[PDB]
Amino acid sequence: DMMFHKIYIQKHDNVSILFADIEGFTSLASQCTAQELVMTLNELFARFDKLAAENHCLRIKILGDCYYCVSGLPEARADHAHCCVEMGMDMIEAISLVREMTGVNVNMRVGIHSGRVHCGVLGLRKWQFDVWSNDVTLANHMEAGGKAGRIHITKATLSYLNGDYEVEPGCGGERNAYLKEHSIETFLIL
Amino acid sequence: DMMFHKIYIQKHDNVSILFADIEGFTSLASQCTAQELVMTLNELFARFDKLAAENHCLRIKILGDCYYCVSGLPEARADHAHCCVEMGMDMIEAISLVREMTGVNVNMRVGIHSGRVHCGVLGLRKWQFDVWSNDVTLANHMEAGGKAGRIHITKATLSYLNGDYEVEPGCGGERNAYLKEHSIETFLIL
Amino acid sequence: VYRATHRLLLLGAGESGKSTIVKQMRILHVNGEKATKVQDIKNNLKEAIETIVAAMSNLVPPVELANPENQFRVDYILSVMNVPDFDFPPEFYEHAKALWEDEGVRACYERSNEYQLIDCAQYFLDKIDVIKQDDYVPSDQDLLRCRVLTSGIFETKFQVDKVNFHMFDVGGQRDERRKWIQCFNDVTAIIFVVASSSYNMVIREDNQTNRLQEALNLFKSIWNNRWLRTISVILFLNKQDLLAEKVLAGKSKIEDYFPEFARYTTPEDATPEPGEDPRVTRAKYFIRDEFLRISTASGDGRHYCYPHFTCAVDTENIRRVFNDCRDIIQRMHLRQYEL
Amino acid sequence: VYRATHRLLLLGAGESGKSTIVKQMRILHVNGEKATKVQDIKNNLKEAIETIVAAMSNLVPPVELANPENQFRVDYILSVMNVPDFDFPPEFYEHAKALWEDEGVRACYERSNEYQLIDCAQYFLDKIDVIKQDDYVPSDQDLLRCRVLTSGIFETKFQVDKVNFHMFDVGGQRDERRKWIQCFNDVTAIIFVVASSSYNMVIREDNQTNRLQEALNLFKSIWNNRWLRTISVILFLNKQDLLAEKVLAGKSKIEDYFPEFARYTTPEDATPEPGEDPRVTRAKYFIRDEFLRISTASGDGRHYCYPHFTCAVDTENIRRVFNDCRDIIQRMHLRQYEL
Amino acid sequence: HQSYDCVCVMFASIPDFKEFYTESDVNKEGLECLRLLNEIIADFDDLLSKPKFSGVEKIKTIGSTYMAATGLSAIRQYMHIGTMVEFAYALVGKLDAINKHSFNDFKLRVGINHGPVIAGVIGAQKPQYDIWGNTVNVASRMDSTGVLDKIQVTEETSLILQTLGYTCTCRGIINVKGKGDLKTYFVNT
Amino acid sequence: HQSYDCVCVMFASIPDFKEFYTESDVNKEGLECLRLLNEIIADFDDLLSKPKFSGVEKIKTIGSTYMAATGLSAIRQYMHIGTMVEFAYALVGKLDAINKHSFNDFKLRVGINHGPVIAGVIGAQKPQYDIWGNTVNVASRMDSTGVLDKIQVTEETSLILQTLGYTCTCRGIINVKGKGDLKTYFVNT
Numbered sequence A, B: 001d002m003m004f005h006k007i008y009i010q011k012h013d014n015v016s017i018l019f020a021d022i023e024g025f026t027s028l029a030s031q032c033t034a035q036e037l038v039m040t041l042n043e044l045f046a047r048f049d050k051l052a053a054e055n056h057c058l059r060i061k062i063l064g065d066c067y068y069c070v071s072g073l074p075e076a077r078a079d080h081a082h083c084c085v086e087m088g089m090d091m092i093e094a095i096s097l098v099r100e101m102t103g104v105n106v107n108m109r110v111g112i113h114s115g116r117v118h119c120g121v122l123g124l125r126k127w128q129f130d131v132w133s134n135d136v137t138l139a140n141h142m143e144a145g146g147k148a149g150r151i152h153i154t155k156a157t158l159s160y161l162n163g164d165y166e167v168e169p170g171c172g173g174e175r176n177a178y179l180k181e182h183s184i185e186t187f188l189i190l
Numbered sequence C, D: 001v002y003r004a005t006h007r008l009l010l011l012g013a014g015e016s017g018k019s020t021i022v023k024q025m026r027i028l029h030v031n032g033e034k035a036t037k038v039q040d041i042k043n044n045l046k047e048a049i050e051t052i053v054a055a056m057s058n059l060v061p062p063v064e065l066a067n068p069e070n071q072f073r074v075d076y077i078l079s080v081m082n083v084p085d086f087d088f089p090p091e092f093y094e095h096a097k098a099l100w101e102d103e104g105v106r107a108c109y110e111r112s113n114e115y116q117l118i119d120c121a122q123y124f125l126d127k128i129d130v131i132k133q134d135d136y137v138p139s140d141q142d143l144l145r146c147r148v149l150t151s152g153i154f155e156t157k158f159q160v161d162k163v164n165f166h167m168f169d170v171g172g173q174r175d176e177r178r179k180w181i182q183c184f185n186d187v188t189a190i191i192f193v194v195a196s197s198s199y200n201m202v203i204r205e206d207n208q209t210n211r212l213q214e215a216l217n218l219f220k221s222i223w224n225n226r227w228l229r230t231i232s233v234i235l236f237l238n239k240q241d242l243l244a245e246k247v248l249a250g251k252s253k254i255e256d257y258f259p260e261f262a263r264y265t266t267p268e269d270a271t272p273e274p275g276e277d278p279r280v281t282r283a284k285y286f287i288r289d290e291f292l293r294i295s296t297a298s299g300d301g302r303h304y305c306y307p308h309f310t311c312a313v314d315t316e317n318i319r320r321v322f323n324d325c326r327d328i329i330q331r332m333h334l335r336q337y338e339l
Numbered sequence E, F: 001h002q003s004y005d006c007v008c009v010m011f012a013s014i015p016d017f018k019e020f021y022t023e024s025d026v027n028k029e030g031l032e033c034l035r036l037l038n039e040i041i042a043d044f045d046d047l048l049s050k051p052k053f054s055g056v057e058k059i060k061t062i063g064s065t066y067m068a069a070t071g072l073s074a075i076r077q078y079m080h081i082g083t084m085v086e087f088a089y090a091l092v093g094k095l096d097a098i099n100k101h102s103f104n105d106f107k108l109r110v111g112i113n114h115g116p117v118i119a120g121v122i123g124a125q126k127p128q129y130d131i132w133g134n135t136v137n138v139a140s141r142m143d144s145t146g147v148l149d150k151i152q153v154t155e156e157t158s159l160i161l162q163t164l165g166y167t168c169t170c171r172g173i174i175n176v177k178g179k180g181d182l183k184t185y186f187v188n189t
């Protein structure tokens, strides 16, 4: 308002954050033209944006081959955990379809976590809606310490799922140092 | 002899160079004690050294979790290609045995190439027998651009194998920049 | 709701006296725990004694014991200096006390500005026989003296005549100053704390930067801060007691650390205390005017500076001056409430 | 087998004349390709003309044309300067020649030490009408003049009275010197090449380091090299023709680039050529003695230095001095064969 | 969306920020932290309004990493590459101003690279402008493997910068995922 | 084989060597190249015979990377860590001498770290002494992510080096495979 520029950010609890990367994305970039790459990419992400609206996830950003969204925004929902899992399901099938077309071995790696966030925009120019917090950080590390073709979830994301989905030991502490060092019990959806 | 220190090195043609790394070695190191790690490692490598004598490969060095040897040394053999492949077979089974014991998902990644080398020792102190050349470099990149649980071989290594083994397209140009940039036709043994 | 509360931020250099002010607020306005703090008092006693003996040899010229016998007690003290969990056995107090009686040790204490020594030294050492008791219960003045370094930000709440206060305590040492920012927005007023007595001392952080100078420089940073343009400062010129003692002692002169004090003549509006030496008046006002030169040179009636001669260990002086401020804080939370 | 062969390494700064010596060895001792080298000769002609015109303006004081008309030919030359695959159309030769006739252009040519100009300039420009012919066949003297920079190491083999030679050619420019090492082991003798005439010139690499000085410094590096303790140097003081011309021209004095030349008086053992000016003698010997001071000051009868005044473009001078060496090379491959 | 031939991309990140980031009751669960980041990113956006930086196009911020490019408003030659560098220095100065007032010490870590890219919009929902290409990944790696208070540039980028009057020092070699090893330089001040 | 508590490990590599490496008929298919490497590694081994480096234990050479450790001949305290550093400087001086004579310009890239290791013999055939542990991997990464003519050290290693009288500058942060991100420093001369 007066001495600090007005901030367009607000706290939100009970949300679930999804992160996904493209497994073998670099080998795909090796095969095709610079242009054809941007179309496969641009097309796949156009598809993901649809699934987002269906599954009730608000898409945040696209950073290269890293896609992420969050259910529970803009307005609060109980299903927030189930939505992201569902989105995660769809994303994994969708990528396998474009895996046919290209004939290359690409796949999605998903990671989800639940907790609070701060959402909004930073700075003055080129506003892009974003989310920030330790929970968002954890979710990203969940994606990073994930497993190919699988939805990697946390402790917190299991207590909002009401055990509707069936999981198994996740062993995320051995694929990511942050998961190790923070004693995070991870699971994989069946 | 007089103005340059005497070199203990000599050229050798028609040899085949094998490189192997431990897939998921870091996740294994996450699970066990510092000591128990050195014993699993030390034990696995003691086993590899046996297979080497059997399969007629001369073991060169152990660099962390990276093991490498070469058939065709010390003295020249026709089977040099078949030996390394055979060694590669054994190594892949052996690692799966210690994968039981630990219960962790470790595996070997093999890479082989054939051509000439220079072998010997460098410097004055702590002599360790070694090999050097572009072919050795290529073989290492073959290991690096390899595929889990598989023996990754080259063009040159297929023309010495006399097609006794059955292969398939290797696609190494998309897993390693050196393989890409040098137009190397790679294959995978079935 | 949020506006009926006054959020106060205590800023100032390390050991200036900020944490003590919060303590006084608990004494004064806030409704079994005294047991825990005994450990920390014993620690101050230990740290004090060992710091003085260690210094004896390292000073130039070095300082000898008055009694050669005490050498063994010196060895004893030095030998248990870095001990992890120290027992505080009965011998410790005897050795410690004997040393404090030694005239040559006190000689080294008088030169303490030449090294780093905690403020509660003389106070605690003077009452070793009180503190060693195993049924010992810390007085309130003991809790005020107990020195523990602050790292982090600690909020205290209180109420005065149903008026609410949210006080924020922070670390004043350099590494800690980076956390201050997290209280700048929504602050009602600054209470900047200064160790008036430390004109003859350097900071711990480098053993070279003069403590009063560091305070001036830090004040300037806060005053001309880009996020504090609106915010007024309540300047506490703390440790007025120690200052006076140093002035009357006449050992180390102010003119030697701040040559400008040589030009200084005492102001007109000066309101000396009853029976206050004119030189003490002259000194404390000089120190105030060094900070007023900083605030005068900028701000443009956008924010203001209100000085107060203080002594944080004195609960009486604090009740008085804090009431002096309750006045202005109302008026300040009103200026920002409108503009 | 391996010992009945003499491995010679040609070392020296860039453009000193090393590649030319190898050429002379083909002329002299080695048994359709002249067609390809015409392209490169045409390139030297182009590079020469455009370098002189470009320099005219950039010199201080700048240089004007003698005929204002030629300005357009100057524009023409400058416009096709960086052209990729140049056609060498009939006009090019007319424009180029006209420029070379212009007296003010030759004025700029005389100051060429003040910029970077290839050696074969005047030679080629003087025979444009010969070179433009489409049935043109390069003489041998043309191939000797053709300037192409060497990058890498190139081996040449030959036989003289059934004696074998393996000659190694290398790049003499700084970036190239790092490859030399790969010939140090197993070398029979060094043939170090020097551009005697370049006392008034700086190297390309920085446009500041004096070419003769760079040669001295480079010689010192080779002479006192840790891997060349045994190896003797055959020092070719090349470009004796250009040197003499510069000495007689009397335009730029040696004493101005190497003040020590002022102290120099000509030696006793000096064996001047028939009808050689005493000043030319004095100069060339001075240049030799600068290199002899380096070799004299170390080596301890472990290796030796044999100087020769040379001219690489002159096939006759080269046959002579190379035979002078065939002698010593036998004797040198014998010292290392025993010790 | 179209393609370009010579766009200069820059990533400037603040490594020490994540450490500063904390969540507690005192700082409104990390909000007072983001408040500072806002003042920083906003202080950086102010630079875009300088006439000398009118060629600079802010692409986005990733966490606390600022991403911008020169030469999108295109079709003497390489003057936009030098501009990108002047901009990096500009950011450093702004960040130093923040330090003065926040009693902190954030250092900037920069990576710049130039080459062919593909600019355009992506996504179905809220279409947003992004650029793609090896040229951009490499710039990213120049940052991620860079040093504090240093601008790391590729060899070619280095070459050009020298024609413009800057000097560079070889950092050494770096392994790029998919492009193999490659030689880099730090710009000098 | 036994374990230790405070061993100082060092990797010194020559990034520019592989470029120098070539195979052609002229250089005996790369042999003249290895000949130079021999002169370098041997020139480095000569340093071990200096009384001041009698605590230094050469472990091996990996390609053209020299690996050595201080404090294996153990059971004032951290004086062996400073020794390892003096040794790195020693290598740089030897390498500069090589340059003088080879008309080259190799720069050394160094990484040092200290901590618990496990020393011993491995393999059935020709039993050879190697050391293992996180302490060693980290030292390796200090090299691989280091800068030319720079010694890169971990934070704790940094702390100790300062008690001994050296100053350090924060490089920034580095991601270690398996240990996450971590802060590093360059030693000053």
Ligand SMILES: C=C[C@@]1(C)CC(=O)[C@]2(O)[C@@]3(C)[C@@H](O)CCC(C)(C)[C@@H]3[C@H](O)[C@H](OC(=O)CCCCN3CCN(C)CC3)[C@@]2(C)O1
Residues within 6 Å of the ligand: A021, A063, A066, A130, A131, A132, A133, A134, A136, A137, A140, E017, E018, E021, E062, E063, E064, E065
């Ligand atoms: C601002 C505070 C703090 C601490 C909290 C936070 O949520 C982040 O903004 C996220 C997590 C969060 O905004 C989600 C996007 C992204 C990009 C993941 C941010 C970065 O990792 C931030 O840190 C960084 O700027 C450094 C890491 C950025 C590298 N990312 C890693 C993930 N891949 C997939 C894309 C690039 C971040 C961690 O910083």
Ligand SMILES: C=C[C@@]1(C)CC(=O)[C@]2(O)[C@@]3(C)[C@@H](O)CCC(C)(C)[C@@H]3[C@H](O)[C@H](OC(=O)CCCCN3CCN(C)CC3)[C@@]2(C)O1
Residues within 6 Å of the ligand: B021, B063, B066, B130, B131, B132, B133, B134, B136, B137, B140, F017, F018, F021, F062, F063, F064, F065
């Ligand atoms: C000496 C010349 C040259 C060019 C040729 C050569 O054969 C090498 O010595 C090999 C290939 C060769 O000796 C096999 C072992 C190893 C260690 C693979 C060497 C290094 O890669 C060398 O380069 C290096 O010193 C840098 C790379 C070293 C990193 N390696 C990569 C492979 N992992 C498995 C272990 C560590 C090398 C490539 O250098």
Ligand SMILES: Nc1nc2c(ncn2[C@@H]2O[C@H](COP(=O)(O)OP(=O)(O)OP(O)(O)=S)[C@@H](O)[C@H]2O)c(=O)[nH]1
Residues within 6 Å of the ligand: C012, C013, C014, C015, C016, C017, C018, C019, C020, C021, C119, C120, C144, C145, C146, C147, C148, C149, C150, C151, C170, C171, C172, C173, C238, C239, C240, C241, C242, C310, C311, C312, C313, C314
């Ligand atoms: N004599 C005297 N001692 C005082 C006075 N104010 C504070 N002290 C003493 O100074 C010591 C340090 O004060 P303290 O309150 O810890 O400073 P601080 O500013 O909180 O220190 P930090 O948290 O930034 S490191 C205390 O142990 C207390 O005895 C005073 O006015 N007079």
Ligand SMILES: Nc1nc2c(ncn2[C@@H]2O[C@H](COP(=O)(O)OP(=O)(O)OP(O)(O)=S)[C@@H](O)[C@H]2O)c(=O)[nH]1
Residues within 6 Å of the ligand: D012, D013, D014, D015, D016, D017, D018, D019, D020, D021, D119, D120, D144, D145, D146, D147, D148, D149, D150, D151, D170, D171, D172, D173, D238, D239, D240, D241, D242, D310, D311, D312, D313, D314
């Ligand atoms: N007038 C004259 N010109 C000479 C003489 N020796 C060589 N040149 C000329 O110098 C030019 C360059 O000589 P060149 O043989 O290319 O040197 P270089 O040492 O091989 O050069 P580099 O390969 O290290 S860059 C040639 O074009 C040739 O005309 C000589 O003695 N007299």
Ligand SMILES: [Mg+2]
Residues within 6 Å of the ligand: C018, C019, C020, C148, C149, C150, C169, C170, C171
């Ligand atoms: Mg405090």
Ligand SMILES: [Mg+2]
Residues within 6 Å of the ligand: D018, D019, D020, D148, D149, D150, D169, D170, D171
């Ligand atoms: Mg040549």
